[PDB]
RNA sequence: UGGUUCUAUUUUCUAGGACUGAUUAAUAGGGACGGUCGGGGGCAUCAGUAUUCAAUUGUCAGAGGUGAAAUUCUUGGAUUUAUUGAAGACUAACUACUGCGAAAGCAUUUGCCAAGGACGUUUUCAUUAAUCAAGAACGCCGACUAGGGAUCGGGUGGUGUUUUUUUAAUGACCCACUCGGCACCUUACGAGACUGGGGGGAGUAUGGUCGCAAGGCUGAAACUUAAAGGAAUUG
């Protein structure tokens, strides 16, 4: 998985911190991936002052959160269903939740899924992440 | 520079609160130096938890004073102590890892302040003369 | 720690003797502690995408590059595309009249190693201090008054919103005060007394000295001399 470069491009401005994290984790299956995120401080409401910087140590703690969150979101689950857990962008959720105790950080997301290594093929696998079938087919006429 | 320091009141009773004895802060003056504290280990902790303000006042003189006249004499000065124990470990910090130029400058600092000292100690004869920092 | 002997009920309590004796605590200085702070340093680790090279496909005739071209590569498949590997660097945007460092300088993550600064302090020492020739390491001014806005680090108080709950502690913002920084905008008031050098700027003249420079068709002079060329050329 992986953004469009206007996405993030349009997402960076300047008077912010981008607290970025990547973490590679081992599925439930045998497939490791690393998978990464990127989160930008935002400002509160009634905020005066133009900068709302991170102190850097509270990025570090953000960025600790996000890593233990993140790998507790992988082991826990396999491709399919961290696949349909990253559709509906529900893991910027609980990355917003969990951090909210720290800085505010507008627009959480993942930018970037890799594969890294992939354990077998297990045709059984994949056929019951599709739907089955089997086909005896049509003879010659002769 | 900043101006970072305590601000002694212009008292110098004890604080009418402090219902204590003036020799039961003695006793665990000493208690804390046989157990084996520094001088301004003993002050904060009485200090913060045995409520005396400072023992100067509280006591009749200094703790220093209390520990020389109670038998629990400090070897080395306490500055010049934690000076000397500063530039040993930059010191074995150098010599674990010796491309550390910034820790070398540091430690030509520190132990210029330790000849600076060790050089008052010793013409105020509070340790022997013939003292060299190894 | 050792030793001697004095009082009344089998063991109770007792008295004596030998191995310290001036101040503060500098809006001076140092040291400890505490929560921290930073792109300060060292080692290790981690990542990123470019680039270069290589392997494998796909397709075919050009690709660089320039103001145009060219050297170069290319049907033994270049350039483009896709997958993957290797290498050496580098740390994009975030990035600032911001931060840290004694200066040169320092920007990915995580950990270790020591360090440092500011703040807080009813901790400690007690003049331990300031400046620099020599030497060592690394490599509109001042002795001067007040302010103002913004920002970085710490602290105190307020009492609203984001936070939230019986797992630990821990935020973010707003406001006032305060300490210390990088700057900026102003104010008031002071004698502030890798070494070697001719003499202003812009010009003008030159019967001096030192130079460089003209002539005149070449050939071609001792030779009025060939070929060829030049020049001018409505034979």
Same mark, same amino acid.
């Given at each position: 998985m992986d953004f469009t470069t206007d996405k993030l491009r349009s997402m960076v401005r300047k008077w912010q911190t981008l607290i970025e994290a990547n973490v590679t984790v081992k599925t439930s299956d045998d497939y490791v991936l690393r998978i990464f995120a990127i989160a930008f401080t935002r400002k509160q409401a009634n905020?005066?002052?133009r900068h709302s910087y991170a102190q850097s140590s509270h990025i570090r703690a953000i960025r600790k959160v996000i890593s233990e969150i993140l790998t507790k979101e992988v082991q826990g689950s396999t491709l399919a269903q961290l696949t349909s857990k990253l559709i509906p962008e529900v893991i910027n959720k609980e990355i917003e939740n969990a951090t909210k105790d720290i800085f505010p950080l507008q627009?959480?997301?993942?930018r970037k899924v890799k594969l890294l290594k992939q354990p077998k093929f297990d045709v059984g696998a994949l056929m019951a992440l599709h739907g089955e079938g089997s086909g005896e087919e049509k003879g010659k006429k002769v | 520079k900043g101006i970072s320091s305590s601000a002694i009141p212009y008292?110098?009773? %004890? *604080?009418?609160?402090?219902? #204590?004895s003036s020799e039961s802060v003695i006793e665990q003056i000493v208690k804390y130096a046989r157990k084996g504290l520094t001088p301004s280990q003993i002050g904060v902790l009485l200090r913060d938890a045995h409520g005396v303000t400072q023992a100067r006042v509280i006591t009749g003189n200094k703790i220093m004073r209390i520990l020389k006249s109670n038998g #629990? %004499? *400090?070897?080395?000065p306490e500055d010049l102590y934690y000076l000397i124990k500063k530039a040993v470990s930059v010191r074995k910090h150098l010599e674990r890892n010796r491309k550390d130029k910034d820790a070398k400058f540091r430690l030509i600092l520190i132990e210029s302040r330790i000849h600076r000292l060790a050089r008052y100690y010793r013409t105020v004869a509070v340790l022997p003369p013939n003292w060299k920092y190894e």
């Open positions: 905020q005066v002052k627009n959480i997301h993942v | 008292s110098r009773n %004890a *604080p009418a609160w402090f219902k #204590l #629990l %004499a *400090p070897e080395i």
